[PDB]
Amino acid sequence: LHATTIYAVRHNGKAAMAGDGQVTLGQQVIMKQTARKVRRLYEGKVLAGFAGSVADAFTLFEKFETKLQQFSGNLERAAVELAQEWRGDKQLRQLEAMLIVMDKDAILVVSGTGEVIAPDDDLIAIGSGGNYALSAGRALKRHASHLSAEEMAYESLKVAADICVFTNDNIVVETL
Amino acid sequence: TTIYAVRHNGKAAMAGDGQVTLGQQVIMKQTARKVRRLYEGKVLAGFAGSVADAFTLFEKFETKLQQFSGNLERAAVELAQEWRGDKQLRQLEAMLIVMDKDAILVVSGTGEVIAPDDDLIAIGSGGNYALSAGRALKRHASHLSAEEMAYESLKVAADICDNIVVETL
Amino acid sequence: TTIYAVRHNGKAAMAGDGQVTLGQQVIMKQTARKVRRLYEGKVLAGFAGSVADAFTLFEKFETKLQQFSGNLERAAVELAQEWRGDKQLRQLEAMLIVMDKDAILVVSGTGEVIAPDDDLIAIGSGGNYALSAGRALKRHASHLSAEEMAYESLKVAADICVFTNDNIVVETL
Numbered sequence: 001l002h003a004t005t006i007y008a009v010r011h012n013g014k015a016a017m018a019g020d021g022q023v024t025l026g027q028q029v030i031m032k033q034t035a036r037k038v039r040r041l042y043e044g045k046v047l048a049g050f051a052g053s054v055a056d057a058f059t060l061f062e063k064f065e066t067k068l069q070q071f072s073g074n075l076e077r078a079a080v081e082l083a084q085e086w087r088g089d090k091q092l093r094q095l096e097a098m099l100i101v102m103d104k105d106a107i108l109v110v111s112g113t114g115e116v117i118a119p120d121d122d123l124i125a126i127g128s129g130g131n132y133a134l135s136a137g138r139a140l141k142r143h144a145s146h147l148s149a150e151e152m153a154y155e156s157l158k159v160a161a162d163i164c165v166f167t168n169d170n171i172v173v174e175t176l
Numbered sequence: 177t178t179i180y181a182v183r184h185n186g187k188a189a190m191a192g193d194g195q196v197t198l199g200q201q202v203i204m205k206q207t208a209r210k211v212r213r214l215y216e217g218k219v220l221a222g223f224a225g226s227v228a229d230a231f232t233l234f235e236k237f238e239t240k241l242q243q244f245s246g247n248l249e250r251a252a253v254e255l256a257q258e259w260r261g262d263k264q265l266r267q268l269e270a271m272l273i274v275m276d277k278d279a280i281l282v283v284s285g286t287g288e289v290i291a292p293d294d295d296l297i298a299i300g301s302g303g304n305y306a307l308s309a310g311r312a313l314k315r316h317a318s319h320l321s322a323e324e325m326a327y328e329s330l331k332v333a334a335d336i337c338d339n340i341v342v343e344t345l
Numbered sequence: 346t347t348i349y350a351v352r353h354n355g356k357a358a359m360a361g362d363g364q365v366t367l368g369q370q371v372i373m374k375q376t377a378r379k380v381r382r383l384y385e386g387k388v389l390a391g392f393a394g395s396v397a398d399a400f401t402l403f404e405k406f407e408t409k410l411q412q413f414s415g416n417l418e419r420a421a422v423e424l425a426q427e428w429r430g431d432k433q434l435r436q437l438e439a440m441l442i443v444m445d446k447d448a449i450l451v452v453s454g455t456g457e458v459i460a461p462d463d464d465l466i467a468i469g470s471g472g473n474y475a476l477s478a479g480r481a482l483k484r485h486a487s488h489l490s491a492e493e494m495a496y497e498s499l500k501v502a503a504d505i506c507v508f509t510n511d512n513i514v515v516e517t518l
Contacts, residue, residue: 304474304477304505305473305474305477306477307477307505308473308474308475308477308478308481308501308502308505309477309478309480309481310481311478311501311504311505312477312478312479312481312482312486312497312498312501313481313485315497316481316482316485316486316489316497317481317482317485317486320485328481328484328485329481332477332480332481332484333477335480336473336476336477336480337473
């Protein structure tokens with residue numbers, strides 16, 4: 001199962017999170033080409049991304065939004081509380097997929113092992129072509145800083161689309 | 177077996193290979209295999225796997241529809257959660273189509289809920305062939321009805337991979 | 346790649362995608378051309394195999410077309426026996442679709458020359474996807490030309506098959 005590719009980056013006082021739309025089951029059959037797995041939370045102030053199952057993304061998004069309300073949009077505090085509740089859930093603890101959360105000032109990666117990580121260079125990618133978009137993003141962040149955060153999000157996913165068969169160019173960028 | 181569903185021009189239809197069954201009315205009725213009406217006849221569901229697992233998933237999805245007041249997406253997500261969490265059901269590779277007057281969704285044991293791009297999906301052995309025929313008809317033969325698209329798509333899939341029953345919602 | 350040939354209303358067309366992955370899932374070519382016109386644009390040829398072996402088969406079939414001066418059936422038969430005969434081309438299991446004004450033929454390295462049933466034939470991974478869309482268009486959208494049918498049939502296959510892209514080249518007769 002491949003449920004789209006998501007790339008997040010904070011750059012030049014702005015924040016963007018983009019994703020393609022290809023959903024592929026197995027190794028050969030495409031089921032959707034215009035999916036949108038990027039979800040806005042907390043009155044449009046928080047962008048969250050999960051390239052896993054819809055059943056798991058629904059439980060995690062509902063619990064992260066719940067924790068965001070408890071701590072009044074505190075991204076860091078709500079992420080570490082969701083992480084231990086993630087690890088506490090014995091159905092969600094088996095999940096190897098990671099969860100990206102970000103507001104205006106921070107990007108965080110949340111794991112089922114309870115780990116909360118701020119990624120190096122303020123960018124991270126998930127999904128089938130995530131490691132490809134992550135590589136393009138590190139290059140653009142270091143050698144093409146003239147691009148905006150939104151341009152970096154689209155261009156890195158565009159590179160992943162031209163290389164990965166499980167990633168298309170139906171890219172939608174969400175900006176805070 | 178193959179199952180095809182499509183929403184087109186305010187009408188919904190789901191088709192599959194046919195059979196003659198006796199129901200509560202004890203009168204011969206030509207139905208579609210592994211295709212059942214649920215939620216007081218307001219939704220149509222189809223499963224490509226076993227007939228026993230089909231009715232197992234049909235009963236679970238109807239209770240979910242009753243829990244969440246007929247919200248197709250909410251009940252589909254909850255069914256996918258209970259699907260991936262069941263011992264015997266999560267091993268199944270066959271997918272389930274759920275469909276009402278407003279949307280079509282495909283639920284899988286992996287925990288996924290997919291809304292097809294153009295209100296059009298097919299499952300089963302010749303599913304991708306009927307999907308290819310349906311996508312061509314949806315774009316170039318939009319004059320056909322939802323029931324006609326269902327019958328014609330399954331006919332093309334049979335010619336490559338006659339007793340076709342189409343259920344109109 | 347995925348090649349799709351269609352004869353419709355006295356017109357002939359052949360379409361092919363251009364994605365090349367070389368056995369992995371990494372795309373290194375997106376605009377490959379595996380559908381060429383031979384015999385001064387009188388016949389169309391499509392190879393589903395490698396880009397280099399396609400050039401060898403296109404040239405050999407081009408020569409056989411000259412030596413028989415346009416007889417597709419004889420040129421394809423003599424190509425199949427020369428294909429099966431040569432040491433380095435005999436093991437290629439990818440098929441070659443050749444097509445002139447009147448007929449479609451499928452040449453194989455086994456020495457076999459197949460005359461397909463209907464005027465619709467496809468080869469490659471997403472061949473059955475384009476064939477499914479082709480029979481749908483040929484039955485409910487016959488107003489489309491053979492060129493439009495070839496492109497639209499491959500477009501449907503590109504959106505469903507992972508290893509078939511939408512960079513489609515279409516050649517007509």
